């Protein structure tokens, strides 16, 4: 088979193959607004026996930082839990989480190790972290190789490319919360509206000076 070792063309094929795996996930996206950031995910719901709301793909890490994930579900869970405890570690050491940049890096390092070492495949998941720290609103992306990039808007999963182009053209940097989620849902629409359906996305927002607010079923459909 193959392992993380460099190919003759300078590529870590296991990482490449990892990246393929995130592409086969469910789309989710996010972007900053005037004074906060929002995360809005597609809901991999198709069965009616699935418990709707209970399956949350926007998960909180700490009251003021959430992450929405894409990729292999299982690896996403564990890695999400890694992040939670790492946040808590900073709270117990330093008193507070003063930089979300840090939080995302530590988690990144974890993934970079499994991409360095043999006897272990890479972590095949992608995630974006958003939240507000002392610096202000931050939107970060995390890749299977451990790569981190800081965004204003970014996407992940199946509608990665699709959503990317939408955002690439139509994103306005300071936009009020309302208009912003709408823009999101339009971008998510274009993409995911290739089955000619979208249903209701799961939507969360945070604004400076407060905690994360995860919306309810009824609200979302109004912006839908």
């Amino acid at each position: 088979r193959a392992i993380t070792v460099f190919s003759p063309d300078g590529r870590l094929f296991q990482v490449e193959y990892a990246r393929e795996a995130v592409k086969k996930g469910s789309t989710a996206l996010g972007m900053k607004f005037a004074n906060g950031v929002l995360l809005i995910s597609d809901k991999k719901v198709r069965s009616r026996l699935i418990e709707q709301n209970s399956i949350e793909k926007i998960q909180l890490i700490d009251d003021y930082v959430a992450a929405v994930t894409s990729g292999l579900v299982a690896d996403a869970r564990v890695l999400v839990d890694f992040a939670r405890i790492s946040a808590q570690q900073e709270k117990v050491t330093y008193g507070s989480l003063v930089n979300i940049e840090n939080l995302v890096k530590r988690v990144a390092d974890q993934m970079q190790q499994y991409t360095q070492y043999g006897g272990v495949r890479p972590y095949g998941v992608s995630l974006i972290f958003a939240g507000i720290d002392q610096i202000g609103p931050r939107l970060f992306d995390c890749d299977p190789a451990g790569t981190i990039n800081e965004y204003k808007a970014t996407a992940i999963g199946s509608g990665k490319d699709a959503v990317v182009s939408f955002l690439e053209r139509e994103y306005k940097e300071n936009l009020p919360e309302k208009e912003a989620v709408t823009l999101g849902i339009k971008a998510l629409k274009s993409s995911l509206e290739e089955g000619e359906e979208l249903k209701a996305p799961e939507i969360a927002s945070i604004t400076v000076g407060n905690k994360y607010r995860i919306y309810d079923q009824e609200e979302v459909k109004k912006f839908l």
């Binding site: 890490i61 808590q88 570690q89 709270k91």
Partner: protein
């Protein structure tokens, strides 16, 4: 130090005096000993400064983590039980700390955890060096038919009493009432001073 927790109806109130010492020689005339530890539970400290802070930072983080994973606040009996287990496990390099934790999950509670991890719930409890004094006045004047207002006032009386007869206690009393209805809310200094004057514990 002296701290007090009073459970009544559908609320619990917890108040502390604010004053660290730290030699004998009272070095801080405004420490912190009552700490919110969760949106529906606060915890009061009455032992040794250092140790006591560490249990607090721990507890903030540990209930916060819990709440996130399970999407629900941790029960009082649970945070209590957990804290006991923490203390009991390293009871031979022990914390010399006397912790009181009250909160409202489905009914109010107030648990007293000693230094060795024994937690027993009672309808009122104090901890600290002025412990006996508030126990005096409470044991005379506590009734479980009290409302919050009467509650806060019984608290204030008791802590003022403690200050007078115990020189380790002292310094501006601060009280927090934790109810299900308004959440955990800590009463502002201005509200408390007014209540002193009225009760005629002012000088």
């Amino acid at each position: 130090t002296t701290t007090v927790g009073i459970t009544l109806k559908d609320a619990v109130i917890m108040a502390t005096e604010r004053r660290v010492t730290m030699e004998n020689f009272i070095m801080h005339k405004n420490g912190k000993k009552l700490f919110q530890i969760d949106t529906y539970t606060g915890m009061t400290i009455a032992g040794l400064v250092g140790d006591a802070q560490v249990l607090v930072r721990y507890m903030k983080a540990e209930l916060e983590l819990y709440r996130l994973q399970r999407r629900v606040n941790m029960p009082i009996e649970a945070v209590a039980t957990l804290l006991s287990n923490m203390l009991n496990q390293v009871k031979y390099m022990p914390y010399m700390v006397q912790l009181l934790v009250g909160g409202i999950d489905t009914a109010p509670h107030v648990f007293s955890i000693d230094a060795a991890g024994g937690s027993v719930e009672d309808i009122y409890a104090s901890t600290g060096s002025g412990s006996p004094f508030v126990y005096g006045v409470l044991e005379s004047q506590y009734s479980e038919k009290m409302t919050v207002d009467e509650g806060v006032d019984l608290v204030i009386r008791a802590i003022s009493a403690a200050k007078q007869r115990d020189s380790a206690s002292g310094g501006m009393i601060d009280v927090a009432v934790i109810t299900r209805k308004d959440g955990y809310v800590q009463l502002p200094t201005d509200q408390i001073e007014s209540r002193i004057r009225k009760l005629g514990l002012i000088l």
